[PDB]
Amino acid sequence: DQSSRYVNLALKEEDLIAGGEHVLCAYIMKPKAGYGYVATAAHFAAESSTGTRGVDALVYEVDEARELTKIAYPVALFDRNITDGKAMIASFLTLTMGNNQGMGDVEYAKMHDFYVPEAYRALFDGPSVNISALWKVLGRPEVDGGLVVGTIIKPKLGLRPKPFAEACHAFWLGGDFIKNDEPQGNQPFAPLRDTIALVADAMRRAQDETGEAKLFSANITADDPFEIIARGEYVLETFGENASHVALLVDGYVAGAAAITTARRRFPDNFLHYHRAGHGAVTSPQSKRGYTAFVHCKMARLQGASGIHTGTSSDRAIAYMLTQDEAQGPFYRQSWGGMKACTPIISGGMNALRMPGFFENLGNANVILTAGGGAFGHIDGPVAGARSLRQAWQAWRDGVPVLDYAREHKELARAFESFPGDADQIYPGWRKALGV
Amino acid sequence: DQSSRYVNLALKEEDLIAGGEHVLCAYIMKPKAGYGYVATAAHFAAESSTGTRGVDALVYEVDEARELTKIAYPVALFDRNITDGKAMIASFLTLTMGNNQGMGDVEYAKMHDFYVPEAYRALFDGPSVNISALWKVLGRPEVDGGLVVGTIIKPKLGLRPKPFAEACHAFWLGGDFIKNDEPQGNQPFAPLRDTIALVADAMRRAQDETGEAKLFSANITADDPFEIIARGEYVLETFGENASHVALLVDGYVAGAAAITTARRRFPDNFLHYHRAGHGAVTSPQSKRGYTAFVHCKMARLQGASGIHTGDRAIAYMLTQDEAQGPFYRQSWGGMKACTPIISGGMNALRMPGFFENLGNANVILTAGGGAFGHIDGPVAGARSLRQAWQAWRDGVPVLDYAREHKELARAFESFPGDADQIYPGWRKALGV
């Protein structure tokens, strides 16, 4: 209702930016069969702002062909806490992704990128701690501390307390970090209270036997915030001297933003592990509505997640936007004005042999790896498998040729052979160089 | 995964229900090119469980032509609170709907219905209060109290505190209930503390002038539960003697399950208005992923929403009856309180009766736009005509008969002639003008 009121196509995006009084959002939107693009874009602006410039959201650019709509949102539109003045993602979502996901003259609309000015950005919580908290526990440097080797305990559900704690103890003989699988909590056959006490003990045992610090990411997701807090408090107290070796895992997608903020504000000294479960329905690229993975992860940083699962366009782009002070998104360049980084958590698996190639492309190895147990395949076993990943990181870090590092490191050496086919392709003459 | 382990097509749904130890879910699932249907469903149950009532989720019925997969989840799989032993929707979502959806051999999966046995249903919060709390305030019978007439203040945002409170006052001369628009909260040009104080006073005035009780639904949505609580406490406090007349609006979609549970458990005596802003991203019927609006609303009753925007008579029945039929499962609610449907749109006085006739009752909250705003005499007249059309239907009096004695209603025909033409042919001569 105001394809003149809600549309100002002569505005310079640079102007908007420089101004610092508007949140900008870029969408991939298509108007229903028949309706005008600009009119519909007008309709989406109005509908996402004022019912019926200044407090009005404006369409500043459109690309009919590209199904591209960019809208400026005055920062005065966003809600903030009566308690402390701070911003809230709930509001950001309502305004730029709310009832506008339900219109009638619009076929689909998906947010691809957003820009938040200094004034607004500064009102967000941001990460309290990141991987540097973990580096510290590991006895690593707080700047470029490198790779954290982890896993997920499997089966997903089924293990009793003792069996679960023994599987933890066993991976900790080779690796650094273990996280509960999504669903693990207080099932009647594996009570959280019992399980956690046993996991804490398994942590002590692997620490004494290994001479190395170990880490656990404990699922505290619940519907009730007070339930989240009681889980967190039970976990930290139980872990005792090992309380700083504990990360708090919250599935922020299924429990939502309030679950995330509960852990963030109540346990700001522990890494807040933001797990993404079933955010598939929206972020998935076959989906034309909602927002992208990029957008999701960028939001996570402002929310205060310490790390978030990001996966093995470009995730590299996600990684940069999450960790750098100045990053380029698909549409907007963003400054973070000193907000702490949010650590990428990568999953899947690459043997020790491919690992190096990943770090090269990324440019750092400052990530948490939560690898399928397959990436831990090795003729000598999974302890050796996890060790080889660490050895591959160490070679890469030191700038030492891998073939040479292997000669003095059994598990990396032995790994070459575990995947002789991979070596061939990658390092021809390894055998030569090894004896084998 | 294991096509022989997680598959038990000899299991009878009837036995499953009677046993009372399995959550059942029905999905519209398509496997990617080249994978066998049973195989894929088996992998889907596996990745959703341990990746009968062992601990493994079992596929008990398949229909590849209809893309139908039904899985039985032992109740032992579901997380429950260490604090009080109650169930959590967060666990229901993760298990039957989390990860398990960004798969490989599976192209799309949408949950269409679920069955909760008694033992598990009993561990959910459920609604604390529903429309019967509003009826009590309005001086209506607590059983079939009928229609609650409201609106949304517009514009969506922009109005200063005083202007906002007066717009409220104005509508309250004709209608019963007003809700904040989803995004209205503590914007710098209309601070929540100032706005709410003015609205509470507009409520006192409207009430003194009309001799009728008025209701307000205030947005308490936030990321921080402690901010949610603070908003709620400030609102109840400020409404003073009118605290019972406030509904707490929470967008459980943008803020999630924990925002809803915060309000449910901290203010169990006030109507929890569950706004779905944004759900349309998943539940819409273009998305072949997530779950339907039916499922969304069904969960909302278990979580404890007092009312939910429903925008069918099937969702309406599932939300309000003690026993309802869903697309695949018949559910008993065991005395768990009804969750009231909140209807919106352009329902004018003329369409009201047909709608009541279909639904079979008028026990809803209508947040009316242009059913009210669209009346020739303005919104107050619009509001009154909606109330008149309900009274006529309630009483068993024909609306033309009623419209003859009630000017608002009569003037509603002139306001919506297409509707009149098409619903009450002969209306013109009848109202004679």
Side-chain angles (χ1 to χ4, degrees):
Chain A
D1 182 343
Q2 290 187 119
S3 168
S4 145
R5 163 114 175 272
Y6 290 100
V7 166
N8 195 170
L9 294 194
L11 280 165
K12 288 307 189 250
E13 180 164 285
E14 290 83 47
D15 273 316
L16 289 181
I17 288 165
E21 290 229 308
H22 308 243
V23 163
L24 319 159
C25 308
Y27 304 84
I28 285 307
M29 185 285 288
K30 182 160 62 98
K32 286 273 163 190
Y35 300 79
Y37 197 94
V38 163
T40 315
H43 193 203
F44 190 107
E47 266 303 296
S48 287
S49 45
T50 56
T52 291
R53 216 217 134 148
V55 152
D56 277 359
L58 312 169
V59 170
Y60 71 87
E61 194 181 315
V62 149
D63 198 338
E64 335 208 343
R66 166 178 79 217
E67 311 186 337
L68 183 79
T69 292
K70 302 178 179 173
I71 295 162
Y73 293 81
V75 291
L77 280 56
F78 304 89
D79 196 0
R80 56 214 74 187
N81 301 162
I82 71 183
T83 55
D84 64 11
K86 309 199 198 338
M88 77 179 56
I89 211 62
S91 171
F92 173 89
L93 291 175
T94 294
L95 272 32
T96 81
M97 226 113 59
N99 286 298
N100 77 211
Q101 277 321 97
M103 293 170 111
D105 59 314
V106 180
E107 185 138 37
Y108 52 61
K110 190 186 202 164
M111 200 195 284
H112 278 47
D113 200 6
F114 59 98
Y115 172 82
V116 308
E118 162 242 312
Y120 187 45
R121 191 187 41 70
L123 288 184
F124 288 91
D125 265 350
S128 185
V129 115
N130 54 28
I131 205 178
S132 88
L134 296 194
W135 289 332
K136 174 158 215 139
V137 164
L138 298 180
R140 308 216 179 157
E142 281 177 289
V143 164
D144 289 307
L147 185 67
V148 176
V149 170
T151 201
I152 304 159
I153 308 285
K154 270 4 153 93
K156 179 177 304 267
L157 285 166
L159 304 169
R160 291 178 261 171
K162 190 202 155 99
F164 184 95
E166 284 307 328
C168 291
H169 165 260
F171 172 88
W172 276 329
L173 289 183
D176 307 309
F177 185 96
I178 301 173
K179 68 175 294 291
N180 270 132
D181 203 355
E182 30 145 68
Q184 305 161 358
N186 194 37
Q187 290 68 18
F189 57 77
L192 179 144
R193 286 192 169 92
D194 300 344
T195 305
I196 293 288
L198 292 187
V199 170
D201 161 82
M203 175 168 290
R204 283 174 209 113
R205 297 185 284 128
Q207 289 181 159
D208 293 351
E209 296 163 16
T210 255
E212 281 161 356
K214 299 300 152 169
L215 298 178
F216 184 67
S217 196
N219 174 38
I220 68 168
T221 312
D223 293 351
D224 182 7
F226 294 104
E227 176 55 13
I228 292 172
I229 299 174
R231 287 179 172 201
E233 303 185 332
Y234 178 76
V235 173
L236 298 183
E237 159 167 332
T238 301
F239 273 91
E241 45 187 79
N242 296 311
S244 67
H245 306 204
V246 172
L248 301 182
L249 176 77
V250 170
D251 186 330
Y253 189 86
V254 310
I260 298 303
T261 305
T262 303
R264 168 66 174 81
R265 309 189 159 211
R266 169 62 59 135
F267 303 118
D269 297 318
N270 285 76
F271 185 104
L272 186 213
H273 182 169
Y274 188 150
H275 185 168
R276 280 191 67 222
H279 71 94
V282 286
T283 61
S284 202
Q286 335 249 148
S287 177
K288 314 222 258 287
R289 337 184 106 74
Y291 45 90
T292 64
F294 176 88
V295 171
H296 189 16
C297 287
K298 193 176 174 183
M299 286 186 296
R301 188 166 177 190
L302 297 164
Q303 294 175 76
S306 281
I308 185 171
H309 176 19
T310 79
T312 11
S313 77
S314 304
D315 344 290
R316 226 178 51 167
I318 294 176
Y320 302 138
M321 177 69 66
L322 291 180
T323 65
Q324 288 170 24
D325 197 51
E326 207 59 59
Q328 192 51 64
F331 287 104
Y332 302 102
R333 173 172 336 153
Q334 175 80 56
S335 328
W336 292 90
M339 188 174 275
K340 283 174 103 140
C342 180
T343 304
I345 300 179
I346 324 291
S347 77
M350 240 192 190
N351 66 45
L353 305 192
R354 283 218 136 280
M355 188 98 334
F358 176 86
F359 311 131
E360 207 72 59
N361 172 92
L362 176 62
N364 65 268
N366 303 328
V367 305
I368 294 138
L369 173 80
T370 67
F376 311 112
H378 191 279
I379 58 174
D380 294 332
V383 162
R387 278 134 161 216
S388 89
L389 297 179
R390 184 193 297 188
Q391 286 174 2
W393 156 67
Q394 279 161 172
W396 178 89
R397 173 200 57 201
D398 289 350
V400 162
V402 166
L403 251 336
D404 302 276
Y405 204 73
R407 300 140 93 253
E408 289 223 42
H409 297 95
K410 202 329 185 75
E411 319 79 345
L412 170 69
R414 277 302 263 168
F416 271 80
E417 295 187 7
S418 285
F419 326 91
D422 232 355
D424 291 337
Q425 344 269 352
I426 317 282
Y427 308 77
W430 60 272
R431 266 178 276 248
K432 198 109 138 206
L434 275 47
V436 299
Chain B
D1 215 308
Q2 329 209 189
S3 173
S4 146
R5 186 180 162 158
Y6 296 99
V7 169
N8 199 354
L9 312 182
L11 283 177
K12 272 96 147 211
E13 201 170 73
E14 325 88 51
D15 305 334
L16 285 175
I17 296 171
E21 35 191 354
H22 300 263
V23 160
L24 319 168
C25 310
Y27 304 91
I28 285 322
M29 206 273 280
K30 197 211 277 154
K32 250 140 183 337
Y35 303 87
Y37 203 89
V38 177
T40 314
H43 176 216
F44 182 108
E47 217 67 303
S48 302
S49 55
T50 60
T52 289
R53 249 290 250 164
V55 137
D56 278 351
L58 308 160
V59 170
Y60 68 88
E61 201 178 296
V62 140
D63 182 350
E64 22 273 309
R66 321 203 252 150
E67 290 176 14
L68 181 78
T69 301
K70 297 179 167 172
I71 299 155
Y73 302 83
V75 290
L77 295 179
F78 298 91
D79 199 358
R80 89 216 41 206
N81 295 349
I82 67 158
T83 53
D84 69 7
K86 304 294 180 229
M88 54 179 89
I89 207 70
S91 174
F92 173 85
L93 291 167
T94 298
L95 281 165
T96 73
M97 208 105 69
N99 204 111
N100 9 131
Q101 268 194 231
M103 225 159 183
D105 44 352
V106 178
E107 202 176 336
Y108 64 61
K110 195 168 201 174
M111 191 185 295
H112 279 232
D113 204 353
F114 64 90
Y115 173 77
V116 286
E118 322 71 88
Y120 187 50
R121 189 256 304 139
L123 306 157
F124 287 86
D125 275 347
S128 192
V129 117
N130 58 24
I131 195 168
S132 97
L134 302 195
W135 289 336
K136 168 138 209 273
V137 158
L138 299 172
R140 306 222 183 146
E142 285 168 56
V143 177
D144 286 321
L147 178 82
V148 173
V149 167
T151 206
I152 316 155
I153 305 290
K154 297 304 222 225
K156 172 158 281 91
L157 282 160
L159 286 186
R160 311 284 287 125
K162 219 260 185 166
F164 178 75
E166 291 313 329
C168 276
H169 168 278
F171 184 77
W172 276 328
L173 292 185
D176 318 300
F177 176 101
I178 292 179
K179 65 174 301 279
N180 264 138
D181 210 343
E182 19 87 0
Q184 298 159 5
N186 187 45
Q187 292 61 26
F189 58 68
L192 183 159
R193 287 188 128 62
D194 288 353
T195 302
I196 296 298
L198 296 185
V199 169
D201 276 338
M203 181 189 273
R204 285 176 191 98
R205 292 193 272 129
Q207 291 192 155
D208 287 342
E209 300 169 357
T210 248
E212 290 191 285
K214 297 301 150 175
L215 316 153
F216 187 64
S217 188
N219 175 224
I220 62 164
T221 307
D223 286 2
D224 185 355
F226 296 83
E227 168 65 13
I228 291 181
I229 296 177
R231 287 183 173 211
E233 289 181 340
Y234 173 79
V235 178
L236 302 185
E237 187 168 63
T238 302
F239 271 89
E241 76 279 359
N242 294 314
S244 64
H245 311 194
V246 187
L248 298 175
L249 178 54
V250 185
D251 187 337
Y253 195 77
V254 298
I260 292 308
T261 304
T262 300
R264 177 54 196 80
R265 300 188 182 210
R266 184 41 171 246
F267 307 110
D269 295 333
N270 286 76
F271 179 102
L272 191 193
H273 182 162
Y274 183 152
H275 197 52
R276 275 167 41 103
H279 72 292
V282 173
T283 68
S284 150
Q286 238 101 184
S287 180
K288 285 81 162 175
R289 336 139 202 99
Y291 51 78
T292 64
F294 176 80
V295 166
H296 192 8
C297 292
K298 188 176 175 175
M299 287 185 288
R301 188 173 173 187
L302 296 165
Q303 287 183 269
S306 295
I308 184 153
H309 177 46
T310 68
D312 203 328
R313 157 187 70 260
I315 286 166
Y317 285 13
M318 189 54 64
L319 286 176
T320 71
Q321 296 278 341
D322 186 62
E323 176 120 327
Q325 174 68 52
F328 291 101
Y329 309 103
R330 165 153 267 258
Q331 180 76 57
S332 305
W333 294 90
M336 174 179 285
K337 174 167 322 187
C339 163
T340 306
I342 309 177
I343 313 301
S344 61
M347 265 276 246
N348 45 51
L350 301 202
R351 287 150 159 127
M352 199 95 341
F355 169 89
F356 292 148
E357 269 313 295
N358 273 237
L359 172 50
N361 61 78
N363 304 322
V364 301
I365 307 167
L366 165 75
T367 65
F373 276 90
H375 176 291
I376 190 169
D377 287 327
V380 162
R384 282 161 179 160
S385 68
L386 283 188
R387 186 200 266 76
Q388 300 162 353
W390 161 62
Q391 276 160 180
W393 177 92
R394 178 197 61 212
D395 287 351
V397 174
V399 156
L400 262 340
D401 290 72
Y402 212 67
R404 297 203 281 65
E405 222 222 305
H406 294 96
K407 112 129 322 97
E408 289 94 351
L409 172 56
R411 291 287 273 175
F413 293 56
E414 300 187 42
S415 318
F416 324 92
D419 276 321
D421 282 331
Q422 189 255 254
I423 304 191
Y424 307 87
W427 76 260
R428 247 171 297 245
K429 210 124 164 208
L431 268 32
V433 176

